[PDB]
Amino acid sequence: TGAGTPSQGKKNTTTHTKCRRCGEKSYHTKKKVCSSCGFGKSAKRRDYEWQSKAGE
Amino acid sequence: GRRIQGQRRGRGTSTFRAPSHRYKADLEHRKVEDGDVIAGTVVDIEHDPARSAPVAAVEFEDGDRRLILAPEGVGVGDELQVGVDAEIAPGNTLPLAEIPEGVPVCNVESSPGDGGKFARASGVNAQLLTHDRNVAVVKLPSGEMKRLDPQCRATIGVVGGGGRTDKPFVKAGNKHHKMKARGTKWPNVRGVAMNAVDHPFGGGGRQHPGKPKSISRNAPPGRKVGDIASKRTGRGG
Amino acid sequence: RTGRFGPRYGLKIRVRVADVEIKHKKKHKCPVCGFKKLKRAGTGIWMCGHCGYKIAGGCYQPETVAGKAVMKA
RNA sequence: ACGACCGUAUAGUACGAGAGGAACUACGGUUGGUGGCCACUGGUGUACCGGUUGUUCGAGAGAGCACGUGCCGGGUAGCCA
RNA sequence: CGAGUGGCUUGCUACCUCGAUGUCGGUUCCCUCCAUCCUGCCCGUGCAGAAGCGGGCAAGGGUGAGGUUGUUCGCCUAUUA
RNA sequence: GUCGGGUGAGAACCCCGACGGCCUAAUGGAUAAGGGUUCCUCAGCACUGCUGAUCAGCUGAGGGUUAGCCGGUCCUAAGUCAUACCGCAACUCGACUAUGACGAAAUGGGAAACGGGUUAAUAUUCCCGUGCCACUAUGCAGUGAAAGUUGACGCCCUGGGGUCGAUCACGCUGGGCAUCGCCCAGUCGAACCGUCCAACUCCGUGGAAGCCGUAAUGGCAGGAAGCGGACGAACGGCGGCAUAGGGAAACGUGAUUCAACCUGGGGCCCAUGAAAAGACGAGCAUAGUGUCCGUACCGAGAACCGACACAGGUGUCCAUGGCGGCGAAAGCCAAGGCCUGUCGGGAGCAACCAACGUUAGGGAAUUCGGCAAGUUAGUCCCGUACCUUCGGAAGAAGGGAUGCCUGCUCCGGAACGGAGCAGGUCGCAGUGACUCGGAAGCUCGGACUGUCUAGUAACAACAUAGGUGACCGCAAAUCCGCAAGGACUCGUACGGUCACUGAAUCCUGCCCAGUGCAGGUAUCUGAACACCUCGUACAAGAGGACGAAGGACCUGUCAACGGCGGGGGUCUUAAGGUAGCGUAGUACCUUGCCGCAUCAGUAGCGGCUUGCAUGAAUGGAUUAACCAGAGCUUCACUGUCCCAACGUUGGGCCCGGUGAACUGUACAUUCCAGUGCGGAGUCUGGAGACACCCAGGGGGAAGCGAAGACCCUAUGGAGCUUUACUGCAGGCUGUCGCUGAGGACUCUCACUCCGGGAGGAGGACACCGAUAGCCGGGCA
RNA sequence: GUGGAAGUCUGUUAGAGUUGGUGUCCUACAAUACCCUCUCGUGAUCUAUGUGUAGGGGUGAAAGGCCCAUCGAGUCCGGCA
Numbered sequence A: 001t002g003a004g005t006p007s008q009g010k011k012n013t014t015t016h017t018k019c020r021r022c023g024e025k026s027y028h029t030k031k032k033v034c035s036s037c038g039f040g041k042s043a044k045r046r047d048y049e050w051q052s053k054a055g056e
Numbered sequence B: 001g002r003r004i005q006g007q008r009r010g011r012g013t014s015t016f017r018a019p020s021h022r023y024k025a026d027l028e029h030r031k032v033e034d035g036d037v038i039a040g041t042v043v044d045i046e047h048d049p050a051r052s053a054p055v056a057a058v059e060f061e062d063g064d065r066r067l068i069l070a071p072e073g074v075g076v077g078d079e080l081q082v083g084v085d086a087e088i089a090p091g092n093t094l095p096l097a098e099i100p101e102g103v104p105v106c107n108v109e110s111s112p113g114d115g116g117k118f119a120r121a122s123g124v125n126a127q128l129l130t131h132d133r134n135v136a137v138v139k140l141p142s143g144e145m146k147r148l149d150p151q152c153r154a155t156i157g158v159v160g161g162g163g164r165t166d167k168p169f170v171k172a173g174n175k176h177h178k179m180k181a182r183g184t185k186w187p188n189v190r191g192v193a194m195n196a197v198d199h200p201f202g203g204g205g206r207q208h209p210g211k212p213k214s215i216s217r218n219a220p221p222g223r224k225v226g227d228i229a230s231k232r233t234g235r236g237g
Numbered sequence C: 001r002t003g004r005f006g007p008r009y010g011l012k013i014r015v016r017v018a019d020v021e022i023k024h025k026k027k028h029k030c031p032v033c034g035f036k037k038l039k040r041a042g043t044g045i046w047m048c049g050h051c052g053y054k055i056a057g058g059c060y061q062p063e064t065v066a067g068k069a070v071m072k073a
Numbered sequence D: 001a002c003g004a005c006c007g008u009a010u011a012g013u014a015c016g017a018g019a020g021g022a023a024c025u026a027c028g029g030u031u032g033g034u035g036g037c038c039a040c041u042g043g044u045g046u047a048c049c050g051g052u053u054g055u056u057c058g059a060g061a062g063a064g065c066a067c068g069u070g071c072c073g074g075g076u077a078g079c080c081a
Numbered sequence E: 001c002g003a004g005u006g007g008c009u010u011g012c013u014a015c016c017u018c019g020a021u022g023u024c025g026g027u028u029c030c031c032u033c034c035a036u037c038c039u040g041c042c043c044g045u046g047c048a049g050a051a052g053c054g055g056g057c058a059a060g061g062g063u064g065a066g067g068u069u070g071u072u073c074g075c076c077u078a079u080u081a
Numbered sequence F: 001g002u003c004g005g006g007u008g009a010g011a012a013c014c015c016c017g018a019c020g021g022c023c024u025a026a027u028g029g030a031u032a033a034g035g036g037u038u039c040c041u042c043a044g045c046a047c048u049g050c051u052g053a054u055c056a057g058c059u060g061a062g063g064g065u066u067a068g069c070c071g072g073u074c075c076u077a078a079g080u081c082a083u084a085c086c087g088c089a090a091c092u093c094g095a096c097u098a099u100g101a102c103g104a105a106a107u108g109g110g111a112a113a114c115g116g117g118u119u120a121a122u123a124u125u126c127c128c129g130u131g132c133c134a135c136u137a138u139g140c141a142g143u144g145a146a147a148g149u150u151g152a153c154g155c156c157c158u159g160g161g162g163u164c165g166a167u168c169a170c171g172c173u174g175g176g177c178a179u180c181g182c183c184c185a186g187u188c189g190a191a192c193c194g195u196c197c198a199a200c201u202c203c204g205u206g207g208a209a210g211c212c213g214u215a216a217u218g219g220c221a222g223g224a225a226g227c228g229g230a231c232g233a234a235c236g237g238c239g240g241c242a243u244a245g246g247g248a249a250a251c252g253u254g255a256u257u258c259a260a261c262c263u264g265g266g267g268c269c270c271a272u273g274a275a276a277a278g279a280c281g282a283g284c285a286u287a288g289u290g291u292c293c294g295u296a297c298c299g300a301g302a303a304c305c306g307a308c309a310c311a312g313g314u315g316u317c318c319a320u321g322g323c324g325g326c327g328a329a330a331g332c333c334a335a336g337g338c339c340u341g342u343c344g345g346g347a348g349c350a351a352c353c354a355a356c357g358u359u360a361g362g363g364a365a366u367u368c369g370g371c372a373a374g375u376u377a378g379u380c381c382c383g384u385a386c387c388u389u390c391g392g393a394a395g396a397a398g399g400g401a402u403g404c405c406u407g408c409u410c411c412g413g414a415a416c417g418g419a420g421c422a423g424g425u426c427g428c429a430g431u432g433a434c435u436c437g438g439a440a441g442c443u444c445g446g447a448c449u450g451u452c453u454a455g456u457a458a459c460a461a462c463a464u465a466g467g468u469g470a471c472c473g474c475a476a477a478u479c480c481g482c483a484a485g486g487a488c489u490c491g492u493a494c495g496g497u498c499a500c501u502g503a504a505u506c507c508u509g510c511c512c513a514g515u516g517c518a519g520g521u522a523u524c525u526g527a528a529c530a531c532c533u534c535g536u537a538c539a540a541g542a543g544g545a546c547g548a549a550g551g552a553c554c555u556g557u558c559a560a561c562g563g564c565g566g567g568g569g570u571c572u573u574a575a576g577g578u579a580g581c582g583u584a585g586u587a588c589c590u591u592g593c594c595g596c597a598u599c600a601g602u603a604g605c606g607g608c609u610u611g612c613a614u615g616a617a618u619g620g621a622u623u624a625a626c627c628a629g630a631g632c633u634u635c636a637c638u639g640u641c642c643c644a645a646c647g648u649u650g651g652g653c654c655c656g657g658u659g660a661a662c663u664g665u666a667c668a669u670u671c672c673a674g675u676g677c678g679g680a681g682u683c684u685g686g687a688g689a690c691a692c693c694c695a696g697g698g699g700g701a702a703g704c705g706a707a708g709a710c711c712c713u714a715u716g717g718a719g720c721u722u723u724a725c726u727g728c729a730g731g732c733u734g735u736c737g738c739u740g741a742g743g744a745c746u747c748u749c750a751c752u753c754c755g756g757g758a759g760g761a762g763g764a765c766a767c768c769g770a771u772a773g774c775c776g777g778g779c780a
Numbered sequence G: 001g002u003g004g005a006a007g008u009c010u011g012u013u014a015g016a017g018u019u020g021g022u023g024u025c026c027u028a029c030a031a032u033a034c035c036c037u038c039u040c041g042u043g044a045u046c047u048a049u050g051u052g053u054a055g056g057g058g059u060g061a062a063a064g065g066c067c068c069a070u071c072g073a074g075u076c077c078g079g080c081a
């Protein structure tokens, strides 16, 4: 079975959804954790220094 | 390379775990204040998914209902007793001290009150040889002579289900069904059939181990494969 | 017996399956009553269809060579 | 756009102790190639005609479908070897 | 032993192509060369004849079917001018 | 699809009718996920729609989803999270232990709803009618009340009860057909309330010594049959519901086979087939309450995922519509759906191409190879070799039969079930289409079913049972973690971990020198602390004594890595190839030699065999069965071939509409020769050459496509290996701290483990922290 | 005779798989498709949903296979010009 087009057919599972905390469609309803703001994992907001160029 | 199979095991993932949730009871000797008065009645004989051997359901005088590591010859209705003054019949449990030397025993405690550790598999049995006020010498199924505190409780008789090993599985399918009831990864791929990256025996234009198979006791996990600290190998001599 | 296996598995494997299972299915003499109405209920479990007595025995035989040594000692 | 071979007469002759055994020429045919043609034989021929299985149109009659003819039997013209 | 011709084999060289000129064999279809296997015309013969052997001119046409092998090559069979 | 017609400025494709078709586990009906308004109405055509459009899933504007009794909600599953505890330099990190919570919408468990009607669009939700559940309140009853039952369960075989459906018989109602008298549709009616009860179990009676009983097993003096009784089922029967409802009408009765549903019996396990909430137990009247969330529509060759209205992918239920037949098979046909797998018009419609039919005579000559195609085919009777693990081989092979019509027989309660008989009779052909094996032999491999390179490898590779060796008594062996801790383990040697070989059968020789592992070890070697000497008012430093693991040394071990020769009638380096097998899937010489087979056989098979360079669990030999595995032979078959032809359908060609891409330094009508960085349309010399266009098959542009994947080069990269260099985890061992009392010893008080506790075991060791030596491609 | 076992047989039942055609396609219907052929089809079976394991780590009946068209070390951003 091709890993391409034919394997795209079974994709009717919902995972990422609109987050209650940040509003981004990044709340993983299976994990109950937002990949965008960290809701469900961290009280503090998810943020990293690598989201921008080192000197900026 | 990559961690070998023996290393994936330890992590305790689903594939390597025993279907505990599908198991019945943790077979252990009952706790008795003292006196021995404790006796109960066999109510039923069930199959133990964890040992592929029968086990007996018992109702005790003080209302307690617990499964028990059943020796051969226990039937519904029989009355079992557990304590210092328990009669000396099959199925009854009492300290090695109170047991007459020369009698076959099973489910022996390593230390008084641990609920039994030795001789619990199908048809096996320990052999109480010597007594004393300090040491009770028992011979375990492996043939070893073990010195035990005479206060160590045990059950009279041999474990039920003897001879299980006598019949061959005949087909992969039967192994399969048995394996599905144990904490084990099956089937087994030989190291020599793997890639160098996956196992110290892997690789090569043909199949053979790289070095000798006898590995030192000091070898680290990932390398300790083959014949571990073998005192010898083969059959000759 | 082993005939369900067809020409598969070889001599020893199926000869032992027949041997074990023939003894296995033999009429067995009940320990409580004395009637030969003991049948295997499952692995290591036996019962008398006559009185209903359910016993603990060998895996393919109600009595094992070792279980007998117990009675004596 | 023709190449080549076999056979007959020549002749059981010339030659030759014998065994054996030609030619010129004239004929008949075959093979390969070439161009064309379909009276003849042969192929096709889901034009056509018949037989018959299953099913549907109530039966009958007459029909549809079964892969672009259900299958079987016959086959004109044309196209072909 | 000496003198050469060819550019099919094999080797040498590293000029051409590494921002790629698709491999061997086979097949199919076309043209060509002659150092001619057959056919035409000839010379010599240790040329009686018949059957050959060797040579000259000559490239018009022909040079086919099969068994083993991927084979090219080659070995083998029966036909063949 | 076609002919008519409707609407419209405009109609091949929007709508109506007829005629003609397509889909039958789906192209029908209901839905899960997922989509998200795509649903309905009106108005439109700039966009989207493979052409057009008056149409639309498009554009714009409105409208549309109604629940005590359908879901959610509640319960608990694998498992997840939160808090506490502990770890960590630390956390948004981390295992355990407690507590709490979360975790099932088709498809786990579960209090209660049916029938009719209605809208453009909802409907067990609204309306009408009827019914039901739970809680609460009032009243009567009741003292019972929590033990127990239920929820609640695997795989295989099977009996009984039984509804719908389907069919048969006959009657009634309506329809169709028009030589008969046939053919089609209907003939209805719920939840619920009440009642009936087969099976199972049990009781009394009875008293079987051979009877009772089953599809089968089975039952019995420990009491069989029979008889009487207790308990006791359906989504089933029966009555109500119902001068409800529905139907134009009639508004039936019996039967068979019986999905659903109910209830039993048997067999299997080295496999044992959830849990909890809840319900029952535990009466009745009347009344009140029953909130919150979901509800439209699609559910797919246009509403989902795949960039698309994508030939792909995507779960559940309808498995009982008719004929057919073994059949949920083919073929044909209903109900229902559709003509939207959405561009059309024209040419006897050429060449060429895709799918395909048929080809005389020959019959594998084709080819690496029978690739492709073909042959055979269903059912019954007869009959069936070698070999074999006795199962099989086997549908071996081979031979015969097969329709229709008339009248019958047998099995059975019967079938619209099955098996036969006699007679008549048609065709070239009776499994008449359809469905539907070609057969046989030799050799190689793996025993077998199974697994695999999603996307060029399905195999001989992996797995497997079976054989074997290794480690470990559980405070274990093995393994994960930095730690706190953890898997194995609800486990305990008949265990489970680590490896090798790979069913069966006959077997499995010799070698311990090297390497590995393990045991032992007088002596030798062997670090640090402490100790002794020298040195320093101290210190650095030098040296000594003692000496752990380890090494030297000795021993054991090959189903441990591996080895099994040259020479002579021993030497390297331990042994010197045994049983077997052998030109091998291993044999260079090689197409070895002989034989079989053929006209001819680098093939195949058999024998020989000095084996370049076979050989025993790096398993050897051999082997029935099995195989989309490799090679060979025969019969059969045939367009694979001789050698091609004709035909069918879709293209191709012409016309209307729609409308890309690849590629392009320039110039360019070339050809033959030459030359040139040695492979030129463009240079040189000649030759040829009027321009433009249509179709073709692809000779050339070293054609297009891809900064060559081969090869080398770079003090490039990565993955892998090891007795490469250097280090790092980990294991072993000595020492110091925890740490205490009296080269060997006792004790108990820290500390560890067992025990519910009392207490028991162990004990200054172990664990843990620090350090030293050895091992250390496990890792960088 | 009864019984009805089997990693048993036939089988496009459903469903799973993917041998040959080296066919069609190869600016595709499709970044793995179509057709015929073929294998399995009561079991080590197939399948939906839920759930667990995470990057030198998983998972692997072992092909260096698979971990969202990405695997001899996923993807994203950063180190980084």
Ligand SMILES: *C(=O)[C@H](Cc1ccccc1)NC(=O)CCCCCN
Binding pocket: E020, E022, F709, F710
């Ligand atoms: C040897 O001749 C190599 C073989 C090869 C190399 C790489 C991968 C597979 C096999 N063949 C070539 O180098 C052919 C090159 C083709 C060049 C065409 N322009």
Ligand SMILES: [Cl-]
Binding pocket: B178
């Ligand atoms: Cl096991």
Ligand SMILES: [Cl-]
Binding pocket: F071
């Ligand atoms: Cl719902």
Ligand SMILES: [Cl-]
Binding pocket: F159, F265
């Ligand atoms: Cl029954």
Ligand SMILES: [K+]
Binding pocket: E017, E018, E020
């Ligand atoms: K090149």
Ligand SMILES: [Mg+2]
Binding pocket: A003
């Ligand atoms: Mg992928």
Ligand SMILES: [Mg+2]
Binding pocket: B025, B026, B027, F490
């Ligand atoms: Mg336990």
Ligand SMILES: [Mg+2]
Binding pocket: B170, B174
């Ligand atoms: Mg078995």
Ligand SMILES: [Mg+2]
Binding pocket: B014, B015, B016, B017, B179, B180, B182, B183, B184, B185
């Ligand atoms: Mg498991």
Ligand SMILES: [Mg+2]
Binding pocket: B188, B189, B190
């Ligand atoms: Mg294995």
Ligand SMILES: [Mg+2]
Binding pocket: B193, B194, B195
């Ligand atoms: Mg490999």
Ligand SMILES: [Mg+2]
Binding pocket: B001, B196, B197, B199, B200
């Ligand atoms: Mg390695």
Ligand SMILES: [Mg+2]
Binding pocket: B207
């Ligand atoms: Mg091997």
Ligand SMILES: [Mg+2]
Binding pocket: B207, B208, F618
């Ligand atoms: Mg090996």
Ligand SMILES: [Mg+2]
Binding pocket: none
């Ligand atoms: Mg037709």
Ligand SMILES: [Mg+2]
Binding pocket: E021
């Ligand atoms: Mg080219």
